[PDB]
């Protein structure tokens, strides 16, 4: 029978800093065992200081991203050029997603940006709309690999303060963009070591009040 | 999941855990399972994440509209039947949600309704809902008494979630407490099981099936 779905691999990761947030994703696109492209971006700038990626079935991810940008276009039109805050973009997406609850967009999406107060923000969605704001989150194939790492290296879980008989948690400080990028790169190299779908390249979108900056690093191509 | 709400002298207690799972994968431990509808109405969630978040945020809207339309705050009975009738319209499509609509109104007093995606809507004083419900009931039922003090109530609801968080693989993260009174819901914190378990063990002297 016709199977309306497929899996194009890839993995994406988002991290929110104090006055920035990043949304990185690998650049490989596959099908079964073949590499479709070594460079096919899946993290995009949607205007209004909002980056989004919908990773999973590319057709769906693409459709989703398209419908959202457009939702941003019409938000401007219908509401006199008002800027779509990230919280609002999020809720909008929930609806985009949940509209297809009975023939889902087989994707795990994330958007990053700055909140109304200027602090970094990341939001992630279940293929049918569940969402929440978070400090960091990875999605896609190597999600299971990368996520634990971030809980540890970003949120300092299980790390306590030396010589306290494990009764005092490590001070929850906030990483700098530089450190975040180091983590992003490691999380990705690691993921490429162990996942056959992850590799080829890593594209990170950094978001600050100064707009959106793009950084690109090569990954293993095997 | 693991959620409870029970009625008593000082009001209603609503305690839920905060874990989200994708099968055996722990998707998150920072999910709010209680949606604050209006200053006197709480809705708890269990089942599909989206289904609950979505239809309960919606419930919130329909509640507001009623305010605008009738000038009076929506009753818990009516608030609940909306969700219920909604859900019943979708019966047979796969919605998955088990929830409790707790609230206080001058007319009904403290009230709790259980509404699930099968369309069962019921009124009662104690309901535990979710994969960890049995675990919660176990603890809840055995120490529950009507003449409980507000403080003891908080602790009990709290403890019951703790219980389920321990035994039920699918529950955990942290407990969120809520007290519903004559004057509205009062949030009583977010407690990380990571630390709550240990404190409770030492102070209470239970969970002896563990060493530490």
């Amino acid at each position: 029978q016709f199977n309306p779905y497929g899996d194009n691999g890839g993995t994406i990761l988002g991290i929110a800093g104090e006055d920035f947030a990043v949304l990185a994703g690998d650049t490989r696109n596959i099908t079964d065992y073949s590499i479709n492209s070594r460079y096919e971006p899946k993290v995009f700038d949607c205007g209004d200081n909002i980056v989004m990626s919908a990773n999973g079935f590319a057709a769906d991810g693409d459709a989703l991203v398209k419908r959202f940008k457009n939702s941003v276009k019409w938000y401007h039109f219908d509401h006199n050029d008002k800027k779509l805050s990230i919280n609002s973009a999020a809720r909008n997406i929930q609806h985009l997603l949940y509209g297809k609850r009975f023939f889902p967009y087989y994707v795990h999406t994330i958007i990053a940006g700055l909140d109304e107060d200027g602090k970094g923000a990341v939001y992630s969605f279940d293929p049918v709309g569940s969402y929440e704001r978070e400090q960091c989150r990875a999605g896609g194939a190597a999600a299971s690999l990368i996520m634990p790492f971030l809980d540890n290296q970003v949120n300092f879980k299980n790390q306590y303060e030396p010589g306290t008989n494990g009764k005092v948690k490590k001070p929850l400080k906030y990483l700098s963009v530089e450190e975040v990028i180091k983590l992003v790169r490691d999380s990705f190299t690691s993921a490429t070591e162990r996942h056959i779908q992850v590799g080829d390249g890593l594209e990170i979108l950094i978001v600050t009040k100064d707009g959106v900056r793009k950084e690109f690093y090569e990954l293993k191509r095997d | 999941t693991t959620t409870l709400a029970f009625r008593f002298q000082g009001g209603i207690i609503v305690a839920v855990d905060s874990r989200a799972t994708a099968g055996n994968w722990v998707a998150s431990q920072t999910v709010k399972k209680v949606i604050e509808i209006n200053p006197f109405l709480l809705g708890t969630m269990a089942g599909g994440a989206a289904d609950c978040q979505f239809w309960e945020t919606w419930l919130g809207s329909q509640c507001r509209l009623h305010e605008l339309r009738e000038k009076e705050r929506i009753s818990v009975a009516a608030a609940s039947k909306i969700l219920s009738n909604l859900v019943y319209q979708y019966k047979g499509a796969g919605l998955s949600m088990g929830t409790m609509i707790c609230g206080y109104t001058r007319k009904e007093g403290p009230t709790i309704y259980y509404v699930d995606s099968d369309g069962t809507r019921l009124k009662g004083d104690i309901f535990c809902v979710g994969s960890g419900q049995t675990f919660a009931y176990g603890v809840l039922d055995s120490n529950y008494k009507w003449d409980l003090s507000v403080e003891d109530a908080l602790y009990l609801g709290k403890r019951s979630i703790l219980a389920a968080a321990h035994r039920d693989a699918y529950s955990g993260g942290s407990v969120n407490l809520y007290h519903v009174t004559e004057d509205g819901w009062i949030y009583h914190g977010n407690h990380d099981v990571g630390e709550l378990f240990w404190k409770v063990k030492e102070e209470e002297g239970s969970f002896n099936n563990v060493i530490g």
């Binding site: 279940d126 293929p127 | 874990r19 994708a22 998707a27 599909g48 998955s96």
Partner: peptide, 4 residues
Amino acid sequence: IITX
């Protein structure tokens, strides 16, 4: 589909 996340669950609870």
